[PDB]
Amino acid sequence: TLSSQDKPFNLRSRDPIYSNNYGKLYEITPEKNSQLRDLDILLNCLQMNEGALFVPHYNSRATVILVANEGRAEVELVGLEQQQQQGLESMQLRRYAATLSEGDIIVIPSSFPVALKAASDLNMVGIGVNAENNERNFLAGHKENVIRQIPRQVSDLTFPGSGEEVEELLENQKESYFVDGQPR
Amino acid sequence: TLSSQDKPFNLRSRDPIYSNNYGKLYEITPEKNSQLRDLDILLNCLQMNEGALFVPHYNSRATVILVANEGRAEVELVGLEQQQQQGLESMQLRRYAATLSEGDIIVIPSSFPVALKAASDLNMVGIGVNAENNERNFLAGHKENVIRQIPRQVSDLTFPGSGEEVEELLENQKESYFVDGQPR
Amino acid sequence: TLSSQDKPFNLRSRDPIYSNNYGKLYEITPEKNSQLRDLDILLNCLQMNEGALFVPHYNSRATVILVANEGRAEVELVGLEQQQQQGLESMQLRRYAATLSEGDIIVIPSSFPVALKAASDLNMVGIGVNAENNERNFLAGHKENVIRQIPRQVSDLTFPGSGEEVEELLENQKESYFVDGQPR
Amino acid sequence: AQNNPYLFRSNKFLTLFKNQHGSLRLLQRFNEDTEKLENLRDYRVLEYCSKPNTLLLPHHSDSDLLVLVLEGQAILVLVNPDGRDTYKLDQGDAIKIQAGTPFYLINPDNNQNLRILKFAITFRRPGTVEDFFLSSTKRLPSYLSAFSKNFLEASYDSPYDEIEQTLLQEEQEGVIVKMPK
Amino acid sequence: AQNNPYLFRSNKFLTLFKNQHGSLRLLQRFNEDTEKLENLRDYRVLEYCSKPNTLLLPHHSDSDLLVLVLEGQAILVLVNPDGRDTYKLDQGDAIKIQAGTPFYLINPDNNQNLRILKFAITFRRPGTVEDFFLSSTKRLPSYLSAFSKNFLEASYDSPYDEIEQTLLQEEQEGVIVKMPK
Amino acid sequence: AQNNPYLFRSNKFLTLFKNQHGSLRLLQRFNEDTEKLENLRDYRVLEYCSKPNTLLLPHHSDSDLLVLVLEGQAILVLVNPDGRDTYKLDQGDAIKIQAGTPFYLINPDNNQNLRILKFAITFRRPGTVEDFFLSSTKRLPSYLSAFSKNFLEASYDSPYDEIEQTLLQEEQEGVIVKMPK
C-alpha cells in the first residue's frame, strides 16, 4: 500500500458511463487513463439489477471480452460472419444463444449486435480490445439511438411503415440502455 | 452537402505533383491531409494525354494500387521477386507485360520499376500503401533523376561507356516524367 | 566524409553502460538516438577482457541478436519455452550450451537468463529487438540486483535459508556485471 | 479464384448482391493468388454502381472505409447518437467513413450513374469485409430479427406484432432502392 | 481443446500448477478453435485464486500483464534494481505489470480468497505466456539451477555448495505458499 | 537449411553473389528452423566483405537497412534527385540507409578488408530482402533491360543502340568491383 504516490500507481471506477435504476456500467478508456493507451485496452465494469436488459447494440471497433463475475447471464448475439465465400447467399445470419455463470467468458466482436438480460443482480467484467475511440452505438431505446437519427424520408424507404410506424415505435420505449427484462 | 463546416469534411485534388503538357498527377499524402496519416494511404490521380509515357520508375516504400478509370493503359513492369531460394541464379528478372481497361486494377510493389504509356486520354486512379514519406525516384528523364546523380567516376565503373556515354545520354531527353509515347 | 553536417549523419559509441576492469558494454537506445526509435532497435557493443563473465541475466522485452565479432565465446542460456502444451509438467527447463567464434550469431529471447564468459579478449556485437525502454535486470552480483531487492521476510519463504543464507550470499560477490571467469 | 497466376494485375470482382437498378462487387483479397501480396492481405477493394434516383439502404461496416467517386454526383450521410452528418459528393471527392457507422448515400438528379470506389481497412477479421443491413431483403432479412420476440419486445416494449410490421418486410429487389423523390 | 465449436463463448481453463491452498488456470488462446478470433490470438487470459494467508512465490513474466481483483484484498509488490514498489490491491483495483518484472503478491487477513483476473499482452511468442519462478518446486526446479556450478560459482564466488543450499530446495506443494505471518 | 534444430544459435549464411575480390552472404530468415523465432521473421541479417580498392556497384534495396562496420575504413554514398550524400565510414560507425535508396560504398587505401554488418527491416515481402542492381553482370543483367526497346527508346529518345551500349555490358566477375583509383 504505503505512501510514496508516484511510480505508475493505480486506477479504479469512478462513474458509470451509464446509470439507470436498472443498471450501471463503469468504463476506462486509454483516452482517459494514462497506462492503458499503451495496451489499446478499454476497462469496463457494470452493475445489472436482478431485472435489467442491455439494449440491442454494437461496438464499432471493440471486441469485448466479458467474463461474468457475479451471477448468471443470458447472452444474445447476432452476426453474419465469414466471407471466404464466393457470393453472400452462402454466408448466414446466425444467432448466438447463450447464458453464462460464475466462470464464463464471452467475446463480442467489433460490430456485432447483442444484449444481456439479468438473471441475478449480476456483475460483469469486460476488457475492451482495439479500443482507441470506440462508439457504443445503440439500436433501441431513447438514447444513443442511431435509428432515430434516420430521417422520416429514408425511414419509409428503409422499412415498411414510413414516417408513421418507424418514427413512432422508437418513441415508445422511454427508457435508455438498461431496461425491463419484463419477460413475456 | 449543407453548411456546418467542421466534423471530418472532405479532401480533393488541388495540384499535380507533376504537370507537363503530356500529363498530370495529383497526390495526397498523409503528411498533407489530416484524415489519411491514420490509414497510412497516399491518394493519387493522374491525367495522361492521348500520347504520354510515365518514365521508368519506382516507389521506395509504396505498393501502389492502380485502377484504370478512363481509357486503356499498357503496363510495363519489372521485378526480381522471390528469395525462398538458396542462392540468386535461382530467382529471375521477369517482365510484367500488361495493358488494362475500364475495370482493371494493378498493384505496383515497393521498389519495382514500371511505366505506362497512354492508349487514350486515359485517367488513372491509384491508392498508395505503406506511405509515410515515400520517394518517387526516377531513372530516366531530366527530373527526379537519380542516375544523373551518380558521378562521372562511378559511372564508368558502373556501365561500359564512362563519363562520356553515361553522362551524355541521360542529358538527351530534355523532357521530365510524362513523355512522348513516340512509338517506334 | 565531407563537411555539410545535417542530413541524417551518424551515430557511435561514446560510453559503456557498464565499465568494470573486466569489461565494457556500449549501448544506443531509440530513446537516445534519433534514427533508431523508428526501427525499434537497440545498438550495443561490448568489451570483454580475456577473463570476464556477464553475470546471469535477462532483458525484459528485448530479444538480442549477438554476433561475435572478435574472439570465441561460451554461451550459457536457460529457458522454459513452449506452451502449446496442455499443462506444465509437459514443457521443460533446458539449458542452452554453446560457445561461438568469428562468424557466430546468437539470439537471446525477451526474458531468458544467460551469461557469457570470455575465452579471448572477445568483442561482441548485438542488435536489440523490440526495444522501447528495456530493462537489464541482473540476478547476481552487486548491482542491478533484483533479488537483493526481495525482502528478508519473503526470502525465507522464497528459498530454504531465510534472511540469513539468502541475504548474505548475494552480499559475497562484491563485483558487478562483468566478473572473474575464475574457472573451477 | 484461387491458386492461379501470382500477379499484381486482377480483373474479376465478386458480385455479392445483384439486381438491375445497381451493383456491388468485391475485389478478391490481394494475397489469395500469390504469396507476393501478403502485406495488403488485410485490405479489400470495393466497387459500387447504381443508377439515377437511388438510395443505398442503411447499413454499417465493421471495417474502416475510403470512398472515391470514379464517375458521378453524390450525397453522403453518416449517422450517430446526436445528429446526422451531411455532405454532397463529387468526382474525386473522396471521404473517410470509419468502422461501424451506419451509412446511406444517394444519386441525384444529374442524369447518370454513380460509380463509387470504396477502400476498406480491415481489423476484426483482417482483410475480411462485412456490412450489416438494417432492414430486410429477399434472401437476407434484418439483423434485428435475429434475436427473439422476447429479447426484442423487451427492448421497445411495443409487441413482436407492432415491432415486426415496421421492422420486417421483404424489400423485393432491395438493398439498392429506387424512388419518386 | 482444438477443432471444436468456433464460438465467441469459452468455459475450460487449463490448470498449469495445481494444489489445495490455491490455483492458477489459463484460458486457451482465442483463435484455437475458430478462424474467427485471429486478432486476439496474441493475448491470453489468466485466472488466479488462493486462500487467506498466502504468498505467490517470486517470478517474472515475459509478457505484459493486466491484473484485476474479481473478488478480494490484495498487496502487490513489483521489484527492481533500486527499490521495490509497494501497493495494496482491492476489488476493481486493476494494475499494469509490465513484461519481465519479478513480482510477488499476497492475501491479507480479511477472511477470504483472492481471485485475480490477469490480462496478458504478448510479444516474444505471441499469445504465448510464460512465467519463470525464482525458486524450486516439486517437478520444476529453479531457473538459476539450469546453468552449472561453474557458471554459477563464478557469479557469487561462494561454492556450488553454499550456493546450492539457499538456492536449491523442493518447496513441496509450492508455487503458491502459506504462512504464520 | 530447414526443419533442423530449433535454436537461437545459427552459423550458415547463404552466399548470393560470389567471386574472389569480395563476398555477400545472407543469414537465413529467423523463423525457418523454429516455431520460436516468429517475431523477427521479418528481419534478415546481412554480411558483406570485400578487399581493398573496391566499389560496391549501384543498387537500391526495397528494405530498410542498418549498416555496421565489423572491421574496416568506409566511404558511403546515398543518392537522390537533388544531390548525393557523402559520409566516410568507420568501426562501429553504423548508419541507417532507408528503403529504396540507390547506394554504393567503397574500401579505401588503409590496407585491409571491410566487413560490413547490414541489418534489414523488411516490409513488401516481410523478412524478404532484395537488391536491384543498376547494371549488368554475368548471369543477372540490368533491370532497365527488362522492358523493351520501345518502352526504353521512348524514355531517353536516343535509340536502343546508343542506349544499349552504355547500359548493357556483362561486367565479368562483377557486382563487387576493383580499380586503379
Side-chain angles (χ1 to χ4, degrees):
Chain A
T1 338
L2 262 100
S3 263
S4 45
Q5 340 275 276
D6 132 96
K7 347 162 98 148
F9 41 140
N10 229 107
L11 70 89
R12 216 164 208 212
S13 247
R14 269 267 93 266
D15 286 70
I17 27 179
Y18 308 115
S19 359
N20 221 269
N21 86 206
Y22 320 62
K24 276 170 186 130
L25 198 108
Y26 288 55
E27 144 183 324
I28 313 147
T29 79
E31 252 116 349
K32 256 122 134 318
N33 217 312
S34 345
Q35 321 203 12
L36 281 38
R37 6 188 179 274
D38 342 286
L39 336 201
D40 211 355
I41 260 52
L42 205 22
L43 270 306
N44 91 21
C45 154
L46 144 325
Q47 329 196 33
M48 254 175 127
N49 282 305
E50 44 130 66
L53 127 178
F54 227 151
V55 103
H57 74 277
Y58 60 78
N59 326 251
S60 63
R61 41 227 313 158
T63 300
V64 156
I65 327 190
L66 232 19
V67 88
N69 180 27
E70 207 242 307
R72 168 137 67 217
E74 353 180 326
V75 164
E76 232 190 19
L77 175 78
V78 194
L80 8 76
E81 29 151 52
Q82 187 213 334
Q83 204 200 284
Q84 227 338 149
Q85 294 356 63
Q86 254 78 71
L88 36 42
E89 299 285 27
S90 337
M91 267 266 131
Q92 267 306 15
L93 103 151
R94 170 98 226 180
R95 183 237 176 207
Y96 298 102
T99 299
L100 322 157
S101 333
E102 178 161 324
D104 292 312
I105 248 121
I106 189 156
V107 247
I108 289 171
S110 319
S111 258
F112 293 54
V114 45
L116 178 154
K117 161 180 142 132
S120 288
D121 247 57
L122 144 134
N123 187 338
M124 271 228 148
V125 217
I127 310 81
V129 233
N130 194 98
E132 139 236 302
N133 78 260
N134 160 111
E135 30 243 297
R136 343 197 75 264
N137 248 204
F138 285 112
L139 12 316
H142 237 296
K143 244 131 135 295
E144 265 90 88
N145 250 10
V146 99
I147 312 262
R148 285 184 44 268
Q149 301 275 43
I150 351 175
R152 228 134 101 127
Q153 218 255 255
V154 181
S155 24
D156 341 348
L157 249 333
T158 296
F159 315 75
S162 237
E164 200 145 302
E165 297 185 69
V166 187
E167 196 131 277
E168 51 156 299
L169 292 124
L170 298 316
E171 225 59 68
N172 292 170
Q173 175 55 273
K174 51 273 145 339
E175 278 290 324
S176 69
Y177 321 98
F178 295 131
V179 134
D180 205 3
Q182 180 58 270
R184 187 265 177 182
Chain B
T1 338
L2 262 100
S3 263
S4 45
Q5 340 275 276
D6 132 96
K7 347 162 98 148
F9 41 140
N10 229 107
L11 70 89
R12 216 164 208 212
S13 247
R14 269 267 93 266
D15 286 70
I17 27 179
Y18 308 115
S19 359
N20 221 269
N21 86 206
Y22 320 62
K24 276 170 186 130
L25 198 108
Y26 288 55
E27 144 183 324
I28 313 147
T29 79
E31 252 116 349
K32 256 122 134 318
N33 217 312
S34 345
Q35 321 203 12
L36 281 38
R37 6 188 179 274
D38 342 286
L39 336 201
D40 211 355
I41 260 52
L42 205 22
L43 270 306
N44 91 21
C45 154
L46 144 325
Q47 329 196 33
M48 254 175 127
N49 282 305
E50 44 130 66
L53 127 178
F54 227 151
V55 103
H57 74 277
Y58 60 78
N59 326 251
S60 63
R61 41 227 313 158
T63 300
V64 156
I65 327 190
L66 232 19
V67 88
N69 180 27
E70 207 242 307
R72 168 137 67 217
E74 353 180 326
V75 164
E76 232 190 19
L77 175 78
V78 194
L80 8 76
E81 29 151 52
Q82 187 213 334
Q83 204 200 284
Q84 227 338 149
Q85 294 356 63
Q86 254 78 71
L88 36 42
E89 299 285 27
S90 337
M91 267 266 131
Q92 267 306 15
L93 103 151
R94 170 98 226 180
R95 183 237 176 207
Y96 298 102
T99 299
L100 322 157
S101 333
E102 178 161 324
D104 292 312
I105 248 121
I106 189 156
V107 247
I108 289 171
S110 319
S111 258
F112 293 54
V114 45
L116 178 154
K117 161 180 142 132
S120 288
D121 247 57
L122 144 134
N123 187 338
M124 271 228 148
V125 217
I127 310 81
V129 233
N130 194 98
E132 139 236 302
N133 78 260
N134 160 111
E135 30 243 297
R136 343 197 75 264
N137 248 204
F138 285 112
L139 12 316
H142 237 296
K143 244 131 135 295
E144 265 90 88
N145 250 10
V146 99
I147 312 262
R148 285 184 44 268
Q149 301 275 43
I150 351 175
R152 228 134 101 127
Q153 218 255 255
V154 181
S155 24
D156 341 348
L157 249 333
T158 296
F159 315 75
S162 237
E164 200 145 302
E165 297 185 69
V166 187
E167 196 131 277
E168 51 156 299
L169 292 124
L170 298 316
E171 225 59 68
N172 292 170
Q173 175 55 273
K174 51 273 145 339
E175 278 290 324
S176 69
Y177 321 98
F178 295 131
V179 134
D180 205 3
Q182 180 58 270
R184 187 265 177 182
Chain C
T1 338
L2 262 100
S3 263
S4 44
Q5 340 275 276
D6 132 96
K7 347 162 98 148
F9 41 140
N10 229 107
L11 70 89
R12 216 164 208 212
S13 247
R14 269 267 93 266
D15 286 70
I17 27 179
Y18 308 115
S19 359
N20 221 269
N21 86 206
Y22 320 62
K24 276 170 186 130
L25 198 108
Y26 288 55
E27 144 183 324
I28 313 147
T29 79
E31 252 116 349
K32 256 122 134 318
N33 217 312
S34 345
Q35 321 203 12
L36 281 38
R37 6 188 179 274
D38 342 286
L39 336 201
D40 211 355
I41 260 52
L42 205 22
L43 270 306
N44 91 21
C45 154
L46 144 325
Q47 329 196 33
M48 254 175 127
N49 282 305
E50 44 130 66
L53 127 178
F54 227 151
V55 103
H57 74 277
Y58 60 78
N59 326 251
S60 63
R61 41 227 313 158
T63 300
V64 156
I65 327 190
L66 232 19
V67 88
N69 180 27
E70 207 242 307
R72 168 137 67 217
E74 353 180 326
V75 164
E76 232 190 19
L77 175 78
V78 194
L80 8 76
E81 29 151 52
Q82 187 213 334
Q83 204 200 284
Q84 227 338 149
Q85 294 356 63
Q86 254 78 71
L88 36 42
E89 299 285 27
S90 337
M91 267 266 131
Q92 267 306 15
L93 103 151
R94 170 98 226 180
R95 183 237 176 207
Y96 298 102
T99 299
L100 322 157
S101 333
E102 178 161 324
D104 292 312
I105 248 121
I106 189 156
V107 247
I108 289 171
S110 319
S111 258
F112 293 54
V114 45
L116 178 154
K117 161 180 142 132
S120 288
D121 247 57
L122 144 134
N123 187 338
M124 271 228 148
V125 217
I127 310 81
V129 233
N130 194 98
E132 139 236 302
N133 78 260
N134 160 111
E135 30 243 297
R136 343 197 75 264
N137 248 204
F138 285 112
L139 12 316
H142 237 296
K143 244 131 135 295
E144 265 90 88
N145 250 10
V146 99
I147 312 262
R148 285 184 44 268
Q149 301 275 43
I150 351 175
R152 228 134 101 127
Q153 218 255 255
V154 181
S155 24
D156 341 348
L157 249 333
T158 296
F159 315 75
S162 237
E164 200 145 302
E165 297 185 69
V166 187
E167 196 131 277
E168 51 156 299
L169 292 124
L170 298 316
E171 225 59 68
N172 292 170
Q173 175 55 273
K174 51 273 145 339
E175 278 290 324
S176 69
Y177 321 98
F178 295 131
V179 134
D180 205 3
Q182 180 58 270
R184 187 265 177 182
Chain D
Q2 211 278 58
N3 240 259
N4 233 179
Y6 120 160
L7 266 137
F8 325 110
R9 193 213 153 156
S10 297
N11 0 5
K12 211 220 101 184
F13 285 45
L14 196 104
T15 289
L16 302 137
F17 178 125
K18 176 212 276 161
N19 85 351
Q20 201 245 176
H21 278 95
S23 186
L24 245 126
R25 286 131 48 253
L26 189 143
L27 192 59
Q28 69 164 234
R29 161 159 35 202
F30 295 103
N31 71 315
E32 280 223 78
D33 29 6
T34 182
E35 279 233 54
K36 301 211 110 296
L37 285 208
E38 249 94 50
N39 14 331
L40 333 143
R41 53 149 251 188
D42 329 336
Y43 286 129
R44 283 323 208 126
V45 108
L46 235 73
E47 280 248 338
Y48 155 79
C49 192
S50 37
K51 291 236 320 246
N53 316 124
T54 27
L55 195 30
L56 158 49
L57 294 179
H59 73 208
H60 77 237
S61 258
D62 47 18
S63 312
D64 284 78
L65 281 171
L66 225 207
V67 185
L68 289 346
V69 265
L70 308 166
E71 64 152 56
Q73 50 291 307
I75 282 298
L76 171 83
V77 229
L78 9 127
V79 92
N80 42 80
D82 276 302
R84 192 189 313 99
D85 223 11
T86 343
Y87 350 67
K88 146 252 13 159
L89 298 146
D90 218 29
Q91 282 271 66
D93 280 35
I95 208 171
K96 192 239 235 245
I97 195 173
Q98 100 189 249
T101 322
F103 74 73
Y104 61 78
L105 72 94
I106 306 130
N107 201 100
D109 343 332
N110 187 48
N111 253 94
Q112 217 203 351
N113 311 272
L114 165 105
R115 223 154 90 270
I116 273 268
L117 183 73
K118 291 131 150 194
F119 201 60
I121 298 86
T122 85
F123 67 63
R124 41 97 17 214
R125 195 116 98 89
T128 333
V129 85
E130 238 143 25
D131 316 74
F132 312 17
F133 313 55
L134 230 220
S135 63
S136 338
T137 99
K138 209 70 114 134
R139 59 275 213 285
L140 265 113
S142 173
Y143 69 66
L144 285 171
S145 100
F147 347 75
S148 201
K149 143 208 204 33
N150 311 86
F151 304 55
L152 269 168
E153 262 191 316
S155 356
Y156 306 111
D157 227 283
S158 333
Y160 211 51
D161 61 74
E162 275 184 28
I163 252 115
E164 205 153 29
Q165 32 98 182
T166 335
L167 203 186
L168 168 84
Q169 33 140 19
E170 47 107 340
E171 224 147 18
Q172 290 62 297
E173 31 118 347
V175 150
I176 317 109
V177 129
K178 194 65 36 292
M179 331 115 87
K181 98 84 133 127
Chain E
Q2 211 278 58
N3 240 259
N4 233 179
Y6 120 160
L7 266 137
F8 325 110
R9 193 213 153 156
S10 297
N11 0 5
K12 211 220 101 184
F13 285 45
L14 196 104
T15 289
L16 302 137
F17 178 125
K18 176 212 276 161
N19 85 351
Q20 201 245 176
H21 278 95
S23 186
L24 245 126
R25 286 131 48 253
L26 189 143
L27 192 59
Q28 69 164 234
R29 161 159 35 202
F30 295 103
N31 71 315
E32 280 223 78
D33 29 6
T34 182
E35 279 233 54
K36 301 211 110 296
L37 285 208
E38 249 94 50
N39 14 331
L40 333 143
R41 53 149 251 188
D42 329 336
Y43 286 129
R44 283 323 208 126
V45 108
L46 235 73
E47 280 248 338
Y48 155 79
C49 192
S50 37
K51 291 236 320 246
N53 316 124
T54 27
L55 195 30
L56 158 49
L57 294 179
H59 73 208
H60 77 237
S61 258
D62 47 18
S63 312
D64 284 78
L65 281 171
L66 225 207
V67 185
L68 289 346
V69 265
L70 308 166
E71 64 152 56
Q73 50 291 307
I75 282 298
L76 171 83
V77 229
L78 9 127
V79 92
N80 42 80
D82 276 302
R84 192 189 313 99
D85 223 11
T86 343
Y87 350 67
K88 146 252 13 159
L89 298 146
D90 218 29
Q91 282 271 66
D93 280 35
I95 208 171
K96 192 239 235 245
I97 195 173
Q98 100 189 249
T101 322
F103 74 73
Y104 61 78
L105 72 94
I106 306 130
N107 201 100
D109 343 332
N110 187 48
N111 253 94
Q112 217 203 351
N113 311 272
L114 165 105
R115 223 154 90 270
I116 273 268
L117 183 73
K118 291 131 150 194
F119 201 60
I121 298 86
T122 85
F123 67 63
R124 41 97 17 214
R125 195 116 98 89
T128 333
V129 85
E130 238 143 25
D131 316 74
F132 312 17
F133 313 55
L134 230 220
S135 63
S136 338
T137 99
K138 209 70 114 134
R139 59 275 213 285
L140 265 113
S142 173
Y143 69 66
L144 285 171
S145 100
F147 347 75
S148 201
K149 143 208 204 33
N150 311 86
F151 304 55
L152 269 168
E153 262 191 316
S155 356
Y156 306 111
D157 227 283
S158 333
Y160 211 51
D161 61 74
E162 275 184 28
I163 252 115
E164 205 153 29
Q165 32 98 182
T166 335
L167 203 186
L168 168 84
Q169 33 140 19
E170 47 107 340
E171 224 147 18
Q172 290 62 297
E173 31 118 347
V175 150
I176 317 109
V177 129
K178 194 65 36 292
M179 331 115 87
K181 98 84 133 127
Chain F
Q2 211 278 58
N3 240 259
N4 233 179
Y6 120 160
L7 266 137
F8 325 110
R9 193 213 153 156
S10 297
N11 0 5
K12 211 220 101 184
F13 285 45
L14 196 104
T15 289
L16 302 137
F17 178 125
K18 176 212 276 161
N19 85 351
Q20 201 245 176
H21 278 95
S23 186
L24 245 126
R25 286 131 48 253
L26 189 143
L27 192 59
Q28 69 164 234
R29 161 159 35 202
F30 295 103
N31 71 315
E32 280 223 78
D33 29 6
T34 182
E35 279 233 54
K36 301 211 110 296
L37 285 208
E38 250 94 50
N39 14 331
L40 333 143
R41 53 149 251 188
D42 329 336
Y43 286 129
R44 283 323 208 126
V45 108
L46 235 73
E47 280 248 338
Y48 155 79
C49 192
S50 37
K51 291 236 320 246
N53 316 124
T54 27
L55 195 30
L56 158 49
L57 294 179
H59 73 208
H60 77 237
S61 258
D62 47 18
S63 312
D64 284 78
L65 281 171
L66 225 207
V67 185
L68 289 346
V69 265
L70 308 166
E71 64 152 56
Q73 50 291 307
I75 282 298
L76 171 83
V77 229
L78 9 127
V79 92
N80 42 80
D82 276 302
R84 192 189 313 99
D85 223 11
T86 343
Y87 350 67
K88 146 252 13 159
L89 298 146
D90 218 29
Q91 282 271 66
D93 280 35
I95 208 171
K96 192 239 235 245
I97 195 173
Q98 100 189 249
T101 322
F103 74 73
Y104 61 78
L105 72 94
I106 306 130
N107 201 100
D109 343 332
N110 187 48
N111 253 94
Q112 217 203 351
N113 311 272
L114 165 105
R115 223 154 90 270
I116 273 268
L117 183 73
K118 291 131 150 194
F119 201 60
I121 298 86
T122 85
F123 67 63
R124 41 97 17 214
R125 195 116 98 89
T128 333
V129 85
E130 238 143 25
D131 316 74
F132 312 17
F133 313 55
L134 230 220
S135 63
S136 338
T137 99
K138 209 70 114 134
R139 59 275 213 285
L140 265 113
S142 173
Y143 69 66
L144 285 171
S145 100
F147 347 75
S148 201
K149 143 208 204 33
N150 311 86
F151 304 55
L152 269 168
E153 262 191 316
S155 356
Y156 306 111
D157 227 283
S158 333
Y160 211 51
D161 61 74
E162 275 184 28
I163 252 115
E164 205 153 29
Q165 32 98 182
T166 334
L167 203 186
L168 168 84
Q169 33 140 19
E170 47 107 340
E171 224 147 18
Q172 290 62 297
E173 31 118 347
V175 150
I176 317 109
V177 129
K178 194 65 36 292
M179 331 115 87
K181 98 84 133 127

